[PDB]
């Protein structure tokens, strides 16, 4: 809830604004002293600073990356990537362990088992499968609203701070007859931690069992029987697989 | 095998001559270092004995 997402449209809007003030200063200077009857807008508006700034951004920013194109999973995981570095963000050499950890609010917004395994480990993340943004840029994930024990099919996208108030059921909790829970002491998570709760106290439920993991981490069969250190490397190494002669 | 020019030319032609023996000298990166500490206005020199 303290870290929003500054995407490509916002970044290119800001670089356009930088080029626009860099040319607005000069056109105000020209309009201050120049002639008036024959002064067109065309010869005083110069397309050099705006195009130069936006081409500099799109060609050589720290977030304008040469796309990985090994397989389709490589490109789609690159296009759903989240970088803590860049202009305005952190730096790789002077980041501690606290920014490189799995915060409990990553449940459903950021994958905990897909990241690089070098000096880039907590600083490059991956968007989860159902994760969205707000209009403000905070990550949100969908939940099914339960009412009087009846888990409905109404879907609410809860942001990072809104879900910290309610008790949200696990997706591995049992349902029947499109009704209610089959047990009383049901697991839930609330205010960070995760403890046992009653079957009527619950406020929400996860929309699916693959809500936590990303795209590439949800192609691994029997992922729940894997250690996380090896599941991370499997999700990494799927993106380096060359396409062979006959698909299988 | 590195930045000693006469040593590496003589080593190549000594190996082709069948005589595996080197005669080494000063690496050229040390002369680069001497010229850079001299260009910092600091007289460094190999004192002869």
């Amino acid at each position: 809830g303290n870290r929003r997402i500054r995407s490509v449209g916002e970044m290119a809007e800001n670089q356009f604004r930088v080029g626009l003030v860099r040319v607005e200063r000069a056109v105000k200077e020209r309009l201050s002293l120049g002639d008036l009857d024959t002064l067109m807008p065309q010869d005083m508006i110069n397309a050099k600073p705006i195009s130069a700034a936006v081409k500099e951004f799109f060609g050589s920013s720290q977030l304008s990356q040469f796309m990985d194109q090994n397989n389709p999973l490589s490109e789609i995981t690159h296009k759903r990537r989240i970088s803590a570095l860049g202009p305005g963000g952190l730096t790789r050499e002077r980041a501690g362990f606290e920014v490189r950890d799995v915060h409990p609010t990553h449940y459903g917004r950021v994958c905990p088992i897909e990241t690089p395994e070098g000096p880039n480990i907590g600083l490059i993340n991956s968007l989860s499968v159902y994760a969205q943004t707000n209009e403000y840029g905070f990550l949100e994930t969908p939940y099914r609203k339960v009412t009087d024990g009846v888990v409905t099919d109404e879907i609410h996208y809860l942001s990072a701070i809104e879900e910290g108030n309610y008790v949200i059921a696990q997706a591995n909790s049992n349902l029947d007859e499109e009704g209610h829970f089959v047990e009383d002491l049901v697991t839930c998570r609330s205010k960070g931690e995760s403890s046992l709760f009653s079957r009527d106290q619950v406020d929400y439920m996860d929309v699916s069992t693959q809500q936590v993991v990303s795209v590439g981490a949800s192609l691994i069969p029997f992922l729940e029987h894997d250690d996380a250190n090896r599941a991370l490397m499997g999700a990494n190494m799927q993106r380096q697989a060359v396409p062979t002669l006959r698909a299988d | 095998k590195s930045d000693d020019v006469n040593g590496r030319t003589k080593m190549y032609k000594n190996i082709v001559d069948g005589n595996h023996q080197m005669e080494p000298g000063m690496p050229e990166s040390f002369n680069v270092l001497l010229k850079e500490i001299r260009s910092l206005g600091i007289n460094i020199e190999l004192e002869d004995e």
Partner: protein
């Protein structure tokens, strides 16, 4: 090219003019239409030499026949273009400018010279203010800074008498006018009357700087540049890109800026410019020269086009990407290549599979040589086409060349010396190197994509060095410990375990066999199994007293597999090493036993045969992994439901509110820990004895044949925790901050976790996964610092002949022995004979290397401790002797001389950083009236002696404790017989009598009030902070007296026993009660790799255990201060020596005790500076060695202790003079300890006073920077400061060390270069 020193000093303007070849006068580099340099430019050919090889610029003189000829049309001499990287220019500066190093590299070297503030110096150089130089009147004193208003009024006042200038010319006039000898005499006579310590240390700084100047011969005005040298153009080249546009050379940009501003200053000075414009131009020239020398130092960094700061000369020297650390201490190399490694399990121990294309490329001049020597190629174009077409005769020549030519195989990072090893190549088809599977533990090389580098050695010296030193059949044992590194790993181990297991009714059991060949025939034909118990006739050879082998044949009770393995066990070993189920430890002990009994070649052949038989029989085993082999215990639901009932009961108790959240959390943590260990024990039992079902009489139990259990039990791969997470329960997973979560993961990896349990475990997964990256960064930095502190330490002598040493005792800290005496002393050399009555009165003589049988002699006679020599007490200056280092652990025999033991020690320490009866001593104690021994001394500890004379148990008895038993009698074990007050410390008196509340006022000295919870009137004493007006000068003293009031007496002394007690000592007793002799009166309440780094960097902790300086009576110092002050009154000497103690620091010893030198007076971690200063060299070695070996023994890492002693000896190389002798060592300055010992040696030779020193424990970084060699210090760290101080002091490196002879390029003084270097020493000495 012969030289024996490298000498640095400051550069004269005539010196820079003498290096010069012509003045650069115009800022143009080259013409850009025609790529030709300009006349007198930055690239000029008339100054810096011609461009083409043996041409002029105008192309008239083209041939070599005009070898050195100055042309006429252009004036550029035709010669080699090699001279463009040797010929420097110069720039005559239009005004003097200051050198940035001797102005900002702190200490400032000019504010230390003139004793001026750096703010005032920069305010003069910045043209902001004047400074007077000479005052003819008395009103003005020298080095006084005037503002411009003061300058104008003094200028109209005095007219012409004084002269104040401004800028770098003023400072150059000051340095030219000062008088160093008179200033040194004035400061030396000032140092007599100087009582202030800060003025004394500042004066010693200035005096040593002046003395360094007058002994070096530098003039002090050469810190102000007037001529500026210019780097040669081939050392700052113009690199064209591909698109016809040259690349930005930052040195060319900065030089061009200096030339532009200097030409403009010349034009302004000629044009009679106004003073504001002239001063602004001079300031711009000064900052441009400062940017060129060191860009990002004074102001903002001058940036280039891409908004990066420009590179300067100090950037080219300093840094990890600098000239030193990137091109002198390690560089790129020819005859080298790399590829991916694979397994060659068909190789011997000295072979690597090298691809054909790789070896053909690496060995091309050898192929040309053999092509000439065989006559198949006469012209070089013919030989080129023959090698390029890859003829079969060329492959025959390559197989002849490769034959008996070792190659070096290396895998980054080279954490220790066994990451480079010489192999003989086999030419294989393919593109991947084939590593032997036994050296993979030394290389740390698994086959998931690791790459390795081949390095061909060329000379016969290099080939024989690779054969006799670095061959993989010479490196059998580690240098770190003595253990072997050629150990079977997991597949050899699984195969040998499966071969030497046993069954009960396998196939053909109970047969009687003629021998191992018949057992092999039986198993191969299939008439028996590998585990069937048989009766084999076995002949084994044992060594006699002399080196012969006699046989003795018998009938054993083995399986078939142990008989088969006996065919490869060589002659000399017993059968008991093969008669059990061999795991990893048993196999490595078999290899070590074979080594110590037989030698090197039988161990090599035995390790290869072990590898082949283990691989073949693991292939024959078929041991797979399936989903049924991880058998879950059936009782898992029962234990989980019982712990669920327990947590429901504790949660119900919290609902009842009789328990709080903290005790609920702690209780549920203990409940789930007990449940986890019970389900782990049930899983391990049902897994390890699952094959109860057997036959031939009954159902007889046996060790299991489960696959997962065999991999776990053989030591091949796995452990109890990992098998627990596979089959039983996952366990208690922690939060990212380190707290434990009250519900655990109760599913294993066979059932599979849910979403929440996987999300819980990802915390610890990413914690470990980021921890590996940050720990390998810190491990690499620590290994670099250790190698650079201990690079020059070579064994240079054979025996120093000293009698010092360390008393190695078995570490008995805790309730157990950690390392026994055999492991702690095996391989040392005795500093003295063993002298005990003991059990047999053993005498082993002095200066004997303790072998294995000598360690067994120490075992069988149960010797307690032995003083052996160490490297920290070697009397050899400039190195150590061989006898104070003892056994070379990589070889086993005694160490030779010319060995880089410091590099071996530093690699051995920094390599596992990625893996990161009753007896009393110090008896001062009395008995109470209850017949029990109370303790009144804080430094007492109890030692349970045994019947054999050793100390197999030790404990520290707390202060305020009491002992139930006595001393010397047989103590019933199994219980800590003493009892202590663990929470509050009492104030026990040892003298009897009735208490009278004298020397105190109840209401003034204490706060007179009953205690708030008991109701009974108590004496709570308020501290010295909140005292009354009369409490600031006196303290409450509980004077224990007689029945009528006379003060009782300390027995033995004259001190009348009144006890000053401090605050927070709650006296519950009132007056009139009887106090015994031995009862109380009141009560007073109370990463590992960073630990290794903090112990080696000698970093002081924030709360040190304050130590008592001398022996005497401890009292309190000056009271009514915020920091309480302490003074110890000696019984013989004078000590008003005070110490400030902070607010929240307690006191362990009160104000009425007798303390000794080195007594702890406050709890906390000790500081090794204080440990050295108050307790000596052997004390600080024992502290550092035990404190590092604590961490290394915790993480299972076995390192010998002579390596840590080598590093401590390199830390202890400095001595400060406290009383001067008869040499010119004044007071309190750090000098080299070996030079001080040599000076005192010659002083006792010629019969004089001698000097008194004191050792200084420096950290690794401080010692490796304060080494007496500026090349090593500059190539380690802080190159700017090191070169600045060395250039000022005028030093010279004598090239005595490994780093200097690596940088310059000669043979190192180690190994095979030791003979040549001592040859050079005797040549330049006896010459």
């Amino acid at each position: 090219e012969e030289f024996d020193a490298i000498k640095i000093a400051l550069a004269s303007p005539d010196m820079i003019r003498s290096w010069s070849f012509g003045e650069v006068k115009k800022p143009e580099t080259i013409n850009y239409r025609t790529f030709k340099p300009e006349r007198d430019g930055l690239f000029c050919a008339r100054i810096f030499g011609p461009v083409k090889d043996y041409e002029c610029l105008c192309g008239k003189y083209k041939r070599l026949k005009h070898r050195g000829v100055i042309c006429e049309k252009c004036g550029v001499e035709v010669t080699q273009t090699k001279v463009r990287r040797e010929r420097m220019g110069h720039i005559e500066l239009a005004s003097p400018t200051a050198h940035i190093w001797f102005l900002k590299s702190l200490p400032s070297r000019i504010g230390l010279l003139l004793d001026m503030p750096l703010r005032d110096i920069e305010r003069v150089l910045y043209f902001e203010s004047y400074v007077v130089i000479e005052g003819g009147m008395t009103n003005l004193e020298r080095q006084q800074i005037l503002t411009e208003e003061q300058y104008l009024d003094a200028l109209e006042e005095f007219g012409d008498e004084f002269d104040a200038k401004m800028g770098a010319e003023a400072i150059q006039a000051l340095l030219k006018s000062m008088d160093l000898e008179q200033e040194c005499e004035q400061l030396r006579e000032e140092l007599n009357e100087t009582n202030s310590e800060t003025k004394r240390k500042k004066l010693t700084k200035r005096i040593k700087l002046l003395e360094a100047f007058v002994q070096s011969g530098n003039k002090p005005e050469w810190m102000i540049l007037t001529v500026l040298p210019v780097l040669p153009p081939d050392l700052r080249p113009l690199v064209p890109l591909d698109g016809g546009r040259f690349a930005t050379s930052d040195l060319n940009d900065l030089y061009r800026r200096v030339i532009n501003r200097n030409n403009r200053l010349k034009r302004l000075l000629d044009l009679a410019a106004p003073d504001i414009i002239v001063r602004n131009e001079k300031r711009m020239l000064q900052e441009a020269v400062d940017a060129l020398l060191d860009n990002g130092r004074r102001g903002r960094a001058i940036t280039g086009s891409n908004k990066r700061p420009l590179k300067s000369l100090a950037d080219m020297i300093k840094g990890k990407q600098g000239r030193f650390r990137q091109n002198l201490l390690g560089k790129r190399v020819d005859y080298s290549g790399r590829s991916v490694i694979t397994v060659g399990p068909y190789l011997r121990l000295h072979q690597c599979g090298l691809p054909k294309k790789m070896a053909l490329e690496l060995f091309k001049p050898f192929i040309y040589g053999k092509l000439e020597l065989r006559g198949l190629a006469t012209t070089i174009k013919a030989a080129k086409k023959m090698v390029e077409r890859e003829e079969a005769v060329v492959w025959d020549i390559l197989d002849e060349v490769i034959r008996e030519h070792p190659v070096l195989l290396n895998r980054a990072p080279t954490l220790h010396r066994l990451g480079i090893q010489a192999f003989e190549p086999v030419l294989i088809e393919g593109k991947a190197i084939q590593l032997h599977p036994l050296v993979c533990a030394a290389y740390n090389a698994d086959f998931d994509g690791d790459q390795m580098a081949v390095h061909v050695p060329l000379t016969l010296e290099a080939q024989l060095e690779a054969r006799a030193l670095m061959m993989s059949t010479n490196n059998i044992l580690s240098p770190a410990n003595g253990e072997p590194i050629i150990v079977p790993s997991q597949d050899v181990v699984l195969g040998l375990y499966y071969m030497t297991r046993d069954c009960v009714n396998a196939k053909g059991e109970g047969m009687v066999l003629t021998g191992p060949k018949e057992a092999e025939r039986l198993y191969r034909s299939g008439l028996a199994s590998l585990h069937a118990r048989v009766k084999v006739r076995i002949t084994e050879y044992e060594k006699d007293a002399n080196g012969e082998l006699v046989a003795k044949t018998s009938l054993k009770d083995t399986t078939v597999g142990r008989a088969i393995l006996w065919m490869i066990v060589p002659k000399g070993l017993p059968y008991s090493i093969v008669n059990q189920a061999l795991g990893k430890k048993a196999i490595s002990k078999m290899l070590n036993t074979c080594y110590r009994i037989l030698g090197l070649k039988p161990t090599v052949i035995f390790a290869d045969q072990i590898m082949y038989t283990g691989f073949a029989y693991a292939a024959r085993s078929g041991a797979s992994v399936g989903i049924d082999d991880m058998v879950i215990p059936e009782k898992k639901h029962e234990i989980i439901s019982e712990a669920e009932a327990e947590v429901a009961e504790i949660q119900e108790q919290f609902q009842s509110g009789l328990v709080t959240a903290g005790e609920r959390y702690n209780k549920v943590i203990d409940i789930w820990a007990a449940a986890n260990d019970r389900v782990s024990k049930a899983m391990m039992d049902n897994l390890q004895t699952e094959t109860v079902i057997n036959r031939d009489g009954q159902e007889e139990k046996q060790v299991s044949f489960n696959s997962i259990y065999m991999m776990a039990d053989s030591g091949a791969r796995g452990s109890a925790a990992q098998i627990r997470q596979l089959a039983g329960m996952r366990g208690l997973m922690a939060k990212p901050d380190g707290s434990i979560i009250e519900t655990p993961i109760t599913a294993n990896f066979r059932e599979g976790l849910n979403v929440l349990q996987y999300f819980i475990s990802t915390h610890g997964a990413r914690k470990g996964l980021a921890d590996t990256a940050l720990k390998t960064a810190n491990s690499g930095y620590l290994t670099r610092r250790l190698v650079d502190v201990a690079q020059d330490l070579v064994v240079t002598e054979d025996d120093c002949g000293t009698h010092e040493g360390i008393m190695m005792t078995p570490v008995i800290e805790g309730g157990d022995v950690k390392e026994p005496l055999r492991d702690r002393v095996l391989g040392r050399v005795t500093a003295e004979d063993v002298l005990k009555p003991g059990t047999a009165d053993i005498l082993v003589p002095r200066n004997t290397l303790l072998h294995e049988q000598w360690c067994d002699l120490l075992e069988e006679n149960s010797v307690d401790a032995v003083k052996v020599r160490s490297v920290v007490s070697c009397d050899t200056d400039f190195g150590v002797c061989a006898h104070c280092y003892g056994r070379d652990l990589a070889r086993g025999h005694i160490i030779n001389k010319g060995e880089a033991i410091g590099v071996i020690a530093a690699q051995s320490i920094g390599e596992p950083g990625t893996q990161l009866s009753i007896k009393l001593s110090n008896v001062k104690s009395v008995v109470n009236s209850s017949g029990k021994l109370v303790i009144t001394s804080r430094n007492t500890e109890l030692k349970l002696i045994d019947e054999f004379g050793r100390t197999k148990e030790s404990y520290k008895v707390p202060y305020g404790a009491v002992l139930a038993k006595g001393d010397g009698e047989q103590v019933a074990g199994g219980e800590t017989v003493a009892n202590w007050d663990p929470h509050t410390m009492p104030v026990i008196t040892e003298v009897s009598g009735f208490v009278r509340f004298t020397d105190m006022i109840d209401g003034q000295t204490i706060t007179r009030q009953t205690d708030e919870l008991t109701g009974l009137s108590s004496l709570v004493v308020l501290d010295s902070a909140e005292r009354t007006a009369g409490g600031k000068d006196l303290r409450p003293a509980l004077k224990i007296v007689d029945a009528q009031g006379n003060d009782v007496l300390i027995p033995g002394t004259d001190m009348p026993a009144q006890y000053f007690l401090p605050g927070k000592a709650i006296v519950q007793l009132e007056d009139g009660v009887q106090i015994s002799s031995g009862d109380t009166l009141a009560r007073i309440p109370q990463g590992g790799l960073p630990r290794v780094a903090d112990l080696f960097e000698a970093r002081r902790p924030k709360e040190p255990a304050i130590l008592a300086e001398i022996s005497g009576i401890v009292s309190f110092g000056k009271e009514t201060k915020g920091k309480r002050r302490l003074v110890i009154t000696p019984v013989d000497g004078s000590d008003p020596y005070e110490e400030m103690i902070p607010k929240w620091r307690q006191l362990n010893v009160f104000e009425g005790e007798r303390v000794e030198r080195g007594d702890v007076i406050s709890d906390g971690p000790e500081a090794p500076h204080d440990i050295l200063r108050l307790r000596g060299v052997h004390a600080v070695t024992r502290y550092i060695v035990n404190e590092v070996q604590d961490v290394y023994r915790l993480q299972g890492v076995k390192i010998n202790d002579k390596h840590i002693e080598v590093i401590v000896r390199q830390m202890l190389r400095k001595a400060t003079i406290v009383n001067a002798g008869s040499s010119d060592f004044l007071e309190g300055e750090q000098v080299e300890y070996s030079r001080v010992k040599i000076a005192n040696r010659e002083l006792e030779a010629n019969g004089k006073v001698g000097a008194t020193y004191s050792r200084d424990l420096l950290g690794i970084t401080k010692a490796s920077l304060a080494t007496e060699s500026f090349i090593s210090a500059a190539s380690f760290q802080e190159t700017t400061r090191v070169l600045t101080e060395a250039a000022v002091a005028g030093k010279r490196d004598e090239l005595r060390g490994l780093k200097e002879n690596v940088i310059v390029g000669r043979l190192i003084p180690a190994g095979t270069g030791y003979a040549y270097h001592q040859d050079r020493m005797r040549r330049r000495a006896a010459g």
